[PDB]
Design a protein around this nucleic acid. Sequence first.
DNA 1: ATTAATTTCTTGACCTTCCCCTTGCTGGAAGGTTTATAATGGGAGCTGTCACGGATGC
DNA 2: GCATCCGTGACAAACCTTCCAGCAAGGGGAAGGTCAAGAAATTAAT
Lengths: 473, 157, 97, 150, 49, 128, 127, 54
Amino acid sequence: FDAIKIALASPDMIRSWSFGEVKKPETINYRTFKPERDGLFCARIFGPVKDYECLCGKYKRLKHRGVICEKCGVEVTQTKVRRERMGHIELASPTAHIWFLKSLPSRIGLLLDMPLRDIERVLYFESYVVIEGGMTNLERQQILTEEQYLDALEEFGDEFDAKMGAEAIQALLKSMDLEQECEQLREELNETNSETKRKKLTKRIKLLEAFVQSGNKPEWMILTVLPVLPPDLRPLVPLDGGRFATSDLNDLYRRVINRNNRLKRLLDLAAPDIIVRNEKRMLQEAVDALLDNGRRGRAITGSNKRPLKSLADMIKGKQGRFRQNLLGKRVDYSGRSVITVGPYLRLHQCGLPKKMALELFKPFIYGKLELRGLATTIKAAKKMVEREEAVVWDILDEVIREHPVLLNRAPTLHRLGIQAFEPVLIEGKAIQLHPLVCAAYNADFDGDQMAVHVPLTLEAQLEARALMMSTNN
Amino acid sequence: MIETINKLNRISRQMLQEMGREPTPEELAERMLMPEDKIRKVLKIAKEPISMETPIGDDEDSHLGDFIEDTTLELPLDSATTESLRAATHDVLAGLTAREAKVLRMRFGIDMNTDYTLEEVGKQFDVTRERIRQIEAKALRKLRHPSRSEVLRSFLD
Amino acid sequence: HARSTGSYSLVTQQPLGGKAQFGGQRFGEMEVWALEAYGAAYTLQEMLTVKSDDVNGRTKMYKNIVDGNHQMEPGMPESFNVLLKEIRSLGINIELE
Amino acid sequence: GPEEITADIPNVGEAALSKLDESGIVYIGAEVTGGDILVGKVTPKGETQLTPEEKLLRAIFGEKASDVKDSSLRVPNGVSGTVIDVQVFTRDGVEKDKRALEIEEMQLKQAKKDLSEELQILEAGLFSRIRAVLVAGGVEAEKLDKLPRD
Amino acid sequence: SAAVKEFFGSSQLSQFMDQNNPLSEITHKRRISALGPGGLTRERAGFEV
Amino acid sequence: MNISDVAKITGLTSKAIRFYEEKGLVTPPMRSENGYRTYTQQHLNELTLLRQARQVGFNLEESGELVNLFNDPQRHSADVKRRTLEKVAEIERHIEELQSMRDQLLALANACPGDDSADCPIIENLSG
Amino acid sequence: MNISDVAKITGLTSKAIRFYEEKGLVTPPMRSENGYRTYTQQHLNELTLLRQARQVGFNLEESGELVNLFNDPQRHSADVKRRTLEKVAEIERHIEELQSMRDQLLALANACPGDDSADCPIIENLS
Amino acid sequence: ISAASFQETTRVLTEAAVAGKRDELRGLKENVIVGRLIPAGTGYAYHQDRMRRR
DNA sequence: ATTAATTTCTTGACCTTCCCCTTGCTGGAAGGTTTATAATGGGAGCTGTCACGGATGC
DNA sequence: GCATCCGTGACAAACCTTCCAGCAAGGGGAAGGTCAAGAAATTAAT
Ligand SMILES: [Ag+]
Ligand SMILES: [Mg+2]
Ligand SMILES: [Zn+2]
């Protein structure tokens, strides 16, 4: 692949994504650590718990790779399927996507020339809208109250058709127009001559031409089926203290599927209009608190009296997925250590502790011990490392020369706050930094926790030696 | 079990009000007319698991999730030996210049999909089970001697 | 306090932090911008894809370094698809080319 | 299965278990080094499905890794030093091994001997006050001092 | 008891007193913070406090 | 010493002694590098003792205690005496229950013999 | 008219009559169109008859053969009388073998009140 | 995908979802986020062969 | 260029667990259903967070 | 065409059904694991 393509999610696209659907709010069993049938962590919908090990213990150990166990639907494969399996919660009623509802700008009113106050009037079950009427009084996108809906019912009858909530605006977005409204807005943009209108109608017609050119539909903007996050990404894992380690997004998804099951129990039981309109309003508020908790209303709390993380709080600022887990990420072969003074070294030379280079260069130590014949296997070399043999210091001195390593102050001030270094082996438990480059670090010896990152392959090793060594700049 | 743990919480609150000290499971077990292991079992499953965004540190910079151990662990052992032992068997069993390596690679599942017993490897070659058992014992007597399988002997750790 | 392939996480398949938790120091975003200001591409492709991210990538890198082959073998990161499935569960269609 | 605290641990040498008792805990004053096992606390693991190469290895040699798993919390590497106390706690209804029994006996001997010496020196000070009152009132160098203090 | 144990040990005012020195103990007991409920936060403060 | 001729000596099969091994009353035997159970002369004495009671002289709940005190090896000839006094008290309560049952059957089970007179209410009298 | 209140009246438990319902012991009652089961008074009479048969010491196969010929106007009481005679004959054979064990064993365990000596003449004579 | 990392990821991610902004990953952080070689420095000569053979 | 005493191969002939099951309960766990005096506007931050744009109302 | 109000950055309590594991005290079927017989393949007389 060489390009990233984004679009709007179709319900048929989610149905192709699903490979299993969730209908019950159970996550796992409370006595045994196994999820039962059709749950939020289930083996039929998402996949098994361990690598090639089914639910009941009938098919395991690479014998059944692609068959499905008829007892509980488990597909016996690796744990890697638990990070890519989707949702498809069978929603009894369509709901509002709060990312396309309460954003700045909202992008559902600028598609329709409707203010956000009227959007709050229609999505919250308080006011009706009519999609089409027999007379010109009940035109398209008219905002009707419940007394005005009763007046239109006693006045028109079967001529009009005015629903309330997410289904009404869903049918309004689905059956407005596709390109005729775009052509009419394109001709009425330059038909009128103004400035306050030509700063929003051009944005509306650019949004609409993006909708027609990208192959997207306004029906796909609203949410009719909600897919859940993969359960390995929201892991209900037993921690080592006795209790469990869950995510709050699991609690929000359990509340969303609980309100969906309450809606499904309200449809067949012939519910009155107040309770089913409050049920669809609560499903809208639950999916709003699941997507972006700080937009539609009060942030939903938990047991510890804290605002729970939504799908938007998972990607927001420094605490989001981007600046904590995607852009600025923790990395292996990174040693936190203080800075000391090595004045008997060259400009491209730094110090390194023998313990930190022993534990830090462990794959290089094992490879150099296996390639020299001094160690038979990997764990024999590991026992030679753990017992501190005399020869592993010599092989560490052999592997540490002609092998640059990246010294890094946290946080860096500029580009010269991190550069490579060719380390030597000394005693102590700290890094002897060359004194000439501490001004380029702007890191005086105040116990600054410097990370030391190891370039692994020869591409990154020669990139460390020939380009970002301190002898290069 | 929700009803029994609510009754247990009410009995524990009553014994807190009647004693002042922390409620031991013995008094709750004798007042619940239940065995004590069931009381500790329903006490184990006490409450909702700590969510992932609780400030376990001193500030709001590092929440939970940066402290969980991996269940699907990939140790230096579990990453290195799981391929180096496979390469060692592919090097040693290639020296077996007859069908004993061909019936031993499917005896346990090496470089194969489905693990077979002696009967399934028999129908391909040697339908009598004890012939495959005797050639497996001959390969065991060849391999158990510490003369050339010492690199296979060092993998016991 | 150093760290070399021990006690990973379960959420985004990430190395941890702290000495009592045995996790390495965070390679933050400012260090990413400085390493990209050098123009170092292969070190940054290790520091965010095959040293910490890809569970099927860091094991292949470890097996390559143990057998002496220090060749850069990249792949699909196991936390970029975390964001992909997160915004796919959010209700937004996205795929690769 | 519950986690037992025993001494027989697989995949480790006898020199690492040389500073342990039959319960796996170090003796008081054991100069441990970074990397050794301080308490042998193994867990009963589930029967995880093995790779066929390790199955062949189990078929060849006598390496039979049973449900015992080397999950004992070792000493963090780089931290040397001795041990000063080993506090053992247990749940009700659970029996005690010999190490927890000897630590409870050591705590009982401490709370006996320290309180007995406290009561002895307190009795000595109270009888010194009594002797001071007796020599302030009258004087008897034979009836009071030569007679025992009880 | 839930309130007086949530305040004692889990609030922003309650923290680990460094018992390395007596000076640290008597400067942590005579420590006037402004965090927690009612007071300001470290990210939402200015130069006036 | 695989237990097949030993099983012919003790008068049992592999399933019953395997169930005895899986219970908490038989000492763990030796495995001769194949999973087969090996039984020595003391193990043969324990096996003949448990089979000389369970098939001959006792039930499982008492022969288990007998073979548990046999591997002490300090045996007691009066602990087994009070054990069999409690056992004969239990079985004399058992046989007085069965003789009361037999007396009740002979009291409320007599009816007409085989003839053309069906519909006997003796089962209804036993119902109550 | 439900099963557990009738079991509490007759002194039985619900698990016993549910195990009888699992096998072919009690005649299956009609479903009351809910999560309960109604009982006929004849079914309650059969239940207390089977309870009286099980409480005195009959095996459940012969008591099942008694209750198969219950609540029906045929009620042949000769072949089932011979079957109960064979049942109590087997019971008396069990009584005979247990009393054979009783007078076989009880003349060997006088001495050795629990000393630490490893010498007993009972086990070496029995085995 | 680089605009969805700075600030207002909700707003610009919705603007990207409703418009169908297919990213060609021409910028330098756009290959940092996807996890491939960057089109800068030593990876520029790799992208010279990547964008020509496409 | 031959074959007669050893040394392997092959085949019945035996030897264990795994699992379902034996009559007879016995207990535990998961799910659904009533109970019938009087019960009718509930509840909870936290601000002592400051300085920008983007949309609303004169 | 201008003043003015929200996102967003901030090293209870009983009542009744089905479903499944345990201890009797073990036997049997399915599936996989080791011992004594005759057949291939070698060598010492011509
Ligand atoms: Ag004796
Ligand atoms: Mg500093
Ligand atoms: Zn299964």
